[PDB]
């Protein structure tokens, strides 16, 4: 119950709707019980009064009750359904907004401690289990408790002994049982979760390995293992169902016990009258109606374990805390920016002995510098550090001779443009997928940006509007690079940090991309990371580094005068 | 769309339920016995209360009509338990059968079709969209059986006593269906659209949550969080236009129940006051009949109330049935089965003429082909990326259908028996896979038994000979799920050992040198050349080094072979191979 408190405290925004739903449910149950009780008592009293009682029996008064009970029950049922289904949606929206807002900040130094895939689906399933929590758990327990209390006091107004016996029976049924049905449930749930995980792992392994398990004759001895695991899983499910039937059996038996106890007790002087008359039907009908109203409580205990697991999972994921902070003190930006590194010795908090030992370089304003090297030497680490994803372990970084620490989120994210290695296409229109960079461009600006070097085939299509991604059109890397560069160009920043811009391409497309990148930005400072030295002769400062350190730096002509650094005397791959 | 799809989905769900007919019939019979037991309990309680409220009888003189009530309660509890268990078994059997059918179809589809989804869609489909069927069947179908059975029994039971109380219950029964269906309903397939929109909203949220990295760079977030709020508002406003109508059925049913109870109570109450005369049957209206009518009235509509509770169970199953029916009705192609076999001791010579390769769904993948492979030779199929290079390999492996003639030592390939053809092959994959537990098993997968010297002299200084005193166990160390602990190359030296363990007659390679370090690449290609020196080999690779030893080099452009020849004759002629080598040289 401890895990539910931080999420039971999220309902303080909308309390009126939940209170209205609870009140309407209570009112409906009370109206039904009162209607049945009144009908029974009227029948018995009229029968016992006889013919010579018509002048001493004012039947006009008990008609307003049997009218109001029906009207109230109908209206309460309808509006309770409506109000509950409104409150559920409002709570769902608030939960989604809160989860996304608390998960946004810890993107780079966060979610990397697990496997990124199959985590988000678990998060979504947990949110669904939480809204199910709200409704299915909160409503019936409070409704039943209030109804029981009201019925008990109303009956106690007549005679205490029977009323308090009925109240004790209902209280013991409501309170004792669900805790007593929460141990074998826990055991079976743990076993079932383990078996389901094993089955999913085996199924994924078989489906992925079907390529080799057929050429090497093996794919007959693994379907058997899959079937055996499925059999064990079904056995666990059957063991759970055999337990869940006992709840209904015991509930019916308890109702029978209460009715029999009422019938035997009310037969010998209820209220202090050895020959009571016309009051025996009262208690019996009240007990029958009340005990045919506790059905929602029976199934409430099944939803608790999954909800608790989901809540604790979400709470643990959320409290992972961020990595870096932002001194939100306001500042301004300038059209001329420069990058100045002096010394950085950075390692990941996870493991150690990575690159970036003593890297040092100076970049002037409006200078194009390309970083060369092999794969894994530490270029990508430099790119990820420069956007302040992680934090420098020890060193200084200055932009315009100003420390990178004293910068707002908006200023830092606006003054630096990044062309990432992987391009993500949102499941939306081309206009929506492209207006991320600049949410002020008209249709003509988008049209001319596209009509520049890059994509011109998508210009006609069915128009700017389309479906991009899983739902609609699919693009390739050659069609992705020229859109990522378009996004970067639209997000006008004085410093552009291009990641690998030509990997996984062909000759003509690479040449066109190089011409585009050389022409469309001839004033913006550019520091791109490449490992294919095609066209690397128009840069005034080439830096080649390996094993996490700089081996030599110089201009192409000057640095080519000391034997092939990577050319290997113009011979190699 | 609308009703035309909902009706066929419901029809398919009903049709796929002929595997638990005995269990369903047993459940229906058990429901019938619950009726007789409810009518017994009511008669006995009325009998006790008319003796106790009128014609005062001592309490200790009604023991005989008292034990039978307890017996009836016990019997009803037993019947409820039995019904629950039978329903669960009936639900489980259908899931078993459906999962078996789906797995069989997926196995028969072939590896070409499987590698289209990111290995999560299939598992999600199977588990999530198969459990809902059991939920729906077990919880719903017995209730439909009960809802028509119990009320007629109650009506028949009440009629002999009074013909007015029975007519009160009869009157309502026509009305609720007609009123409900005609005015107050008519939008039942519209709720399917709302459910689909609700699911797609979660899908869009998931898509946004995957893109959290690309939103951090551009400064979005606070400006993006409004989109979720706007979408949720739109969804809520759209949804609450139909819930003002779909909730009228509950109001109608509650109103009819209350009206019936009130009418019965009023009639029987005013009967004894000497103000009414309808159905005393020339004897006289007694309280024992009024109490029976009052007690049995709630039990009339209770089966129908439970049907409202089980709506979310049926609406959830239709969503799964939609995807299951879509999957099971897709038209495929499949390869053609074979019958002939051949001898195990002979070289294999492959020839073809005007051969086309087709994807399992459609479209031509490899255009026209024309080649001839002498026995014992080594052939390399180089070319531009995305030209369908890895299509001849799948055509030879028997994973794809084809048009034309593909001859393996004379005989075609549509006539060979797979269980006698796949014994002549040995495969090396681009992306390694380890579908076992122990590292020894992933090596002996070809033959799950051997001596103790092949694990010594398997391949070379590979992960079998060397790379042993680096793992905290021996050769029986459990690899794990998808070789998570073995990250360097995803173990592209155990797959080569597995291929090299078994002597073969046609070795197929599919870019084996990808994602390895320089020493690992050197050792891998050394072992590969040593293996290919012994038998016919067909290699598809992108590396352009040490190709002087290969007999013939094929260049594949747009699925068509353009130039064939040795390295010396083809590195100077100036064809597409010249352009490829020039580009690779310009890389450094
Ligand atoms: C937004 C899509 C939804 C629609 C269209 C919908 C519609 C309905 C309908 C038609 C009923 C039955 C009314 C009757 O019996 O005549 C119902 C009942 C109910 N719904 Fe929903 N519902 C939706 C989502 C939800 C959600 C998110 C919850 C919360 C978990 C929920 C919980 C319930 C409950 C508790 C009941 C009554 C008892 C039950 O059937 O479980 N529903 N809803």
Short mmCIF file of N, CA, C and O and ligand atoms in Angstrom, two decimals, chain A residues 77 80-81 84-85 88-89 92 128 130-136, chain B residues 180 190-192 194-195 198 235 239 242-243 246-251 304-313 315, ligand 1:
data_model
loop_
_atom_site.label_atom_id
_atom_site.label_comp_id
_atom_site.label_asym_id
_atom_site.label_seq_id
_atom_site.Cartn_x
_atom_site.Cartn_y
_atom_site.Cartn_z
N UNK A 77 -28.03 5.20 -11.33
CA UNK A 77 -27.26 4.27 -12.15
C UNK A 77 -26.71 4.97 -13.39
O UNK A 77 -25.50 4.91 -13.68
N UNK A 80 -24.13 7.77 -12.52
CA UNK A 80 -22.92 7.19 -11.96
C UNK A 80 -22.03 6.61 -13.05
O UNK A 80 -20.81 6.83 -13.05
N UNK A 81 -22.63 5.87 -13.99
CA UNK A 81 -21.84 5.38 -15.12
C UNK A 81 -21.16 6.53 -15.85
O UNK A 81 -19.95 6.50 -16.11
N UNK A 84 -18.31 8.29 -13.68
CA UNK A 84 -17.13 7.45 -13.55
C UNK A 84 -16.33 7.42 -14.84
O UNK A 84 -15.09 7.53 -14.81
N UNK A 85 -17.01 7.28 -15.98
CA UNK A 85 -16.27 7.23 -17.23
C UNK A 85 -15.65 8.57 -17.60
O UNK A 85 -14.70 8.60 -18.39
N UNK A 88 -12.35 8.74 -15.16
CA UNK A 88 -11.29 7.84 -15.59
C UNK A 88 -10.43 8.48 -16.68
O UNK A 88 -9.20 8.43 -16.64
N UNK A 89 -11.08 9.09 -17.68
CA UNK A 89 -10.34 9.71 -18.77
C UNK A 89 -9.51 10.89 -18.28
O UNK A 89 -8.35 11.06 -18.70
N UNK A 92 -6.47 9.54 -16.57
CA UNK A 92 -5.54 8.98 -17.54
C UNK A 92 -4.70 10.07 -18.20
O UNK A 92 -3.48 9.93 -18.34
N UNK A 128 -1.88 1.76 -17.96
CA UNK A 128 -3.21 1.17 -18.10
C UNK A 128 -3.63 0.45 -16.82
O UNK A 128 -4.77 0.60 -16.34
N UNK A 130 -2.76 1.18 -13.92
CA UNK A 130 -3.05 2.19 -12.91
C UNK A 130 -4.45 2.79 -13.05
O UNK A 130 -5.12 3.04 -12.04
N UNK A 131 -4.90 3.05 -14.27
CA UNK A 131 -6.27 3.57 -14.37
C UNK A 131 -7.28 2.49 -13.95
O UNK A 131 -8.29 2.78 -13.27
N UNK A 132 -7.00 1.24 -14.34
CA UNK A 132 -7.81 0.13 -13.86
C UNK A 132 -7.80 0.07 -12.34
O UNK A 132 -8.84 -0.19 -11.71
N UNK A 133 -6.63 0.30 -11.73
CA UNK A 133 -6.54 0.44 -10.28
C UNK A 133 -7.57 1.43 -9.77
O UNK A 133 -8.44 1.07 -8.98
N UNK A 134 -7.47 2.68 -10.24
CA UNK A 134 -8.36 3.71 -9.73
C UNK A 134 -9.79 3.20 -9.69
O UNK A 134 -10.37 3.03 -8.62
N UNK A 135 -10.33 2.86 -10.86
CA UNK A 135 -11.75 2.52 -10.89
C UNK A 135 -12.03 1.28 -10.04
O UNK A 135 -12.67 1.35 -8.98
N UNK A 136 -11.47 0.14 -10.47
CA UNK A 136 -11.89 -1.16 -9.95
C UNK A 136 -11.59 -1.32 -8.47
O UNK A 136 -12.27 -2.09 -7.78
N UNK B 180 -34.70 -1.31 -26.31
CA UNK B 180 -33.25 -1.21 -26.22
C UNK B 180 -32.63 -1.11 -27.61
O UNK B 180 -31.95 -0.13 -27.91
N UNK B 190 -19.94 1.73 -33.64
CA UNK B 190 -19.28 3.01 -33.42
C UNK B 190 -18.36 2.96 -32.20
O UNK B 190 -17.37 3.70 -32.14
N UNK B 191 -18.67 2.09 -31.23
CA UNK B 191 -17.78 1.92 -30.09
C UNK B 191 -16.46 1.27 -30.50
O UNK B 191 -15.43 1.48 -29.85
N UNK B 192 -16.48 0.47 -31.57
CA UNK B 192 -15.25 -0.11 -32.09
C UNK B 192 -14.29 0.98 -32.56
O UNK B 192 -13.08 0.90 -32.34
N UNK B 194 -14.15 4.02 -31.36
CA UNK B 194 -13.62 4.67 -30.16
C UNK B 194 -12.52 3.82 -29.52
O UNK B 194 -11.50 4.35 -29.08
N UNK B 195 -12.72 2.51 -29.46
CA UNK B 195 -11.69 1.63 -28.91
C UNK B 195 -10.42 1.68 -29.76
O UNK B 195 -9.30 1.72 -29.22
N UNK B 198 -8.64 4.87 -29.05
CA UNK B 198 -7.98 4.80 -27.74
C UNK B 198 -6.68 4.02 -27.83
O UNK B 198 -5.67 4.41 -27.23
N UNK B 235 -9.93 13.35 -27.96
CA UNK B 235 -10.42 11.98 -27.79
C UNK B 235 -11.57 11.92 -26.79
O UNK B 235 -12.56 11.22 -27.03
N UNK B 239 -15.34 10.80 -27.65
CA UNK B 239 -15.89 9.61 -27.01
C UNK B 239 -17.22 9.90 -26.33
O UNK B 239 -18.16 9.11 -26.45
N UNK B 242 -21.02 9.41 -27.85
CA UNK B 242 -21.73 8.15 -27.99
C UNK B 242 -22.06 7.50 -26.65
O UNK B 242 -22.97 6.66 -26.59
N UNK B 243 -21.36 7.86 -25.57
CA UNK B 243 -21.66 7.28 -24.27
C UNK B 243 -22.93 7.86 -23.66
O UNK B 243 -23.46 7.28 -22.71
N UNK B 246 -25.15 4.98 -25.40
CA UNK B 246 -24.88 3.59 -25.07
C UNK B 246 -25.21 3.25 -23.63
O UNK B 246 -25.31 2.07 -23.29
N UNK B 247 -25.39 4.25 -22.77
CA UNK B 247 -25.71 4.02 -21.37
C UNK B 247 -27.20 4.05 -21.08
O UNK B 247 -27.60 3.92 -19.92
N UNK B 248 -28.03 4.24 -22.11
CA UNK B 248 -29.48 4.24 -21.90
C UNK B 248 -30.03 2.84 -21.66
O UNK B 248 -31.09 2.70 -21.05
N UNK B 249 -29.32 1.80 -22.13
CA UNK B 249 -29.79 0.43 -21.94
C UNK B 249 -29.85 0.07 -20.46
O UNK B 249 -30.81 -0.57 -20.00
N UNK B 250 -28.83 0.46 -19.69
CA UNK B 250 -28.83 0.18 -18.26
C UNK B 250 -30.00 0.88 -17.57
O UNK B 250 -30.66 0.28 -16.71
N UNK B 251 -30.25 2.13 -17.92
CA UNK B 251 -31.39 2.83 -17.36
C UNK B 251 -32.71 2.15 -17.69
O UNK B 251 -33.58 2.02 -16.83
N UNK B 304 -29.54 -11.00 -16.82
CA UNK B 304 -29.34 -9.93 -17.78
C UNK B 304 -28.41 -8.84 -17.26
O UNK B 304 -27.69 -8.22 -18.04
N UNK B 305 -28.42 -8.59 -15.95
CA UNK B 305 -27.51 -7.59 -15.39
C UNK B 305 -26.06 -8.00 -15.57
O UNK B 305 -25.20 -7.16 -15.86
N UNK B 306 -25.76 -9.29 -15.40
CA UNK B 306 -24.39 -9.76 -15.54
C UNK B 306 -23.88 -9.61 -16.97
O UNK B 306 -22.68 -9.45 -17.18
N UNK B 307 -24.78 -9.65 -17.96
CA UNK B 307 -24.36 -9.43 -19.34
C UNK B 307 -23.79 -8.03 -19.54
O UNK B 307 -22.88 -7.85 -20.36
N UNK B 308 -24.29 -7.05 -18.79
CA UNK B 308 -23.71 -5.72 -18.85
C UNK B 308 -22.30 -5.67 -18.30
O UNK B 308 -21.46 -4.91 -18.79
N UNK B 309 -22.02 -6.48 -17.27
CA UNK B 309 -20.68 -6.50 -16.69
C UNK B 309 -19.66 -7.11 -17.65
O UNK B 309 -18.49 -6.72 -17.64
N UNK B 310 -20.08 -8.05 -18.49
CA UNK B 310 -19.19 -8.76 -19.39
C UNK B 310 -19.03 -8.07 -20.74
O UNK B 310 -18.55 -8.69 -21.69
N UNK B 311 -19.44 -6.80 -20.86
CA UNK B 311 -19.28 -6.10 -22.13
C UNK B 311 -17.81 -5.85 -22.44
O UNK B 311 -17.38 -6.03 -23.59
N UNK B 312 -17.03 -5.44 -21.44
CA UNK B 312 -15.62 -5.17 -21.67
C UNK B 312 -14.84 -6.43 -22.03
O UNK B 312 -13.76 -6.32 -22.62
N UNK B 313 -15.36 -7.61 -21.69
CA UNK B 313 -14.71 -8.85 -22.09
C UNK B 313 -14.92 -9.15 -23.57
O UNK B 313 -14.01 -9.62 -24.25
N UNK B 315 -15.79 -6.81 -25.99
CA UNK B 315 -15.22 -5.75 -26.81
C UNK B 315 -13.71 -5.87 -26.91
O UNK B 315 -13.12 -5.43 -27.91
C1 LIG C 1 -13.07 4.72 -23.54
C2 LIG C 1 -13.54 3.57 -23.99
C3 LIG C 1 -14.60 2.94 -23.23
C4 LIG C 1 -15.88 2.72 -23.61
C5 LIG C 1 -16.49 3.09 -24.93
C6 LIG C 1 -16.52 2.09 -22.53
C7 LIG C 1 -17.86 1.73 -22.60
C8 LIG C 1 -18.45 1.02 -21.59
C9 LIG C 1 -19.65 0.32 -21.71
C10 LIG C 1 -20.48 0.23 -22.95
C11 LIG C 1 -19.90 -0.24 -20.52
C12 LIG C 1 -21.04 -1.12 -20.13
C13 LIG C 1 -22.33 -0.34 -19.98
C14 LIG C 1 -23.40 -1.39 -19.91
O1 LIG C 1 -23.22 -2.39 -19.20
O2 LIG C 1 -24.44 -1.26 -20.57
C15 LIG C 1 -18.86 0.09 -19.67
C16 LIG C 1 -18.82 -0.32 -18.37
C17 LIG C 1 -17.67 -0.17 -17.64
N1 LIG C 1 -16.51 0.35 -18.02
FE1 LIG C 1 -16.12 1.04 -19.69
N2 LIG C 1 -15.67 1.92 -21.52
C18 LIG C 1 -14.48 2.42 -21.87
C19 LIG C 1 -13.29 2.47 -21.16
C20 LIG C 1 -13.21 2.11 -19.84
C21 LIG C 1 -12.13 2.36 -19.00
C22 LIG C 1 -10.86 3.07 -19.35
C23 LIG C 1 -12.46 1.85 -17.78
C24 LIG C 1 -11.64 1.88 -16.58
C25 LIG C 1 -10.98 0.78 -16.28
C26 LIG C 1 -13.74 1.28 -17.88
C27 LIG C 1 -14.38 0.68 -16.85
C28 LIG C 1 -15.70 0.28 -16.97
C29 LIG C 1 -16.38 -0.33 -15.84
C30 LIG C 1 -15.76 -0.56 -14.49
C31 LIG C 1 -17.62 -0.61 -16.25
C32 LIG C 1 -18.77 -1.23 -15.50
C33 LIG C 1 -18.47 -2.61 -14.95
C34 LIG C 1 -17.64 -3.34 -15.96
O3 LIG C 1 -18.14 -3.61 -17.07
O4 LIG C 1 -16.47 -3.66 -15.68
N3 LIG C 1 -14.17 1.44 -19.15
N4 LIG C 1 -17.97 0.87 -20.33
#
